[PDB]
């Protein structure tokens, strides 16, 4: 504890996110919505938009 600020210990937590084409398992607090078809509208299908 008597060392300088450049030699002090540091706790490092590294988080890695697997962004691939696999189906998702980790998704946060966002509610779902009933679907709609045969009319042009914004869709959030599988996270991908359009």
């Amino acid at each position: 504890p008597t060392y300088g600020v450049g030699h002090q210990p540091y706790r490092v937590v590294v988080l890695s996110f697997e962004l691939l084409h696999a189906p998702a398992t980790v998704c946060g607090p966002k509610k779902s919505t009933n679907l709609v078809k045969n009319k042009c509208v914004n869709f959030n299908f599988n996270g991908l938009t359009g």
Partner: protein, 99 residues
């Protein structure tokens, strides 16, 4: 206002021993990577040393304006090398005032 200059020439320079000598935050180098210094090599090496306060640390940079950059110590616009700075409140401070 009276910073010294040390000529460094004809030296086998290992730059990994600097991290074991001073407890600094960042090994700030402008025109070269700090970790790449072993491979490439240059002709002449200079070393400078001075003590400033915390408000004017950012003025030691190319193209900077301030009290130190105008009246005390000015860096060239095309500077390459490394600038090493660290806090020294445990050595350069006195309870009666370091004058």
């Amino acid at each position: 206002y009276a910073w010294n200059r040390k000529r460094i020439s004809n030296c086998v320079a290992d730059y990994s021993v600097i991290y074991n000598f001073a407890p600094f935050f960042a090994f700030k180098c402008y025109g070269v990577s700090p970790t790449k210094l072993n491979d490439l090599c240059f002709t002449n090496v200079y070393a400078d040393s001075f003590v400033i306060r915390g408000n004017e640390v950012s003025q030691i940079a190319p193209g900077q304006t301030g009290n130190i950059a105008d009246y005390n110590y000015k860096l060239p616009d095309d500077f390459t090398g490394c600038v090493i700075a660290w806090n020294s409140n445990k050595l350069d401070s006195k309870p009666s005032g370091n004058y």
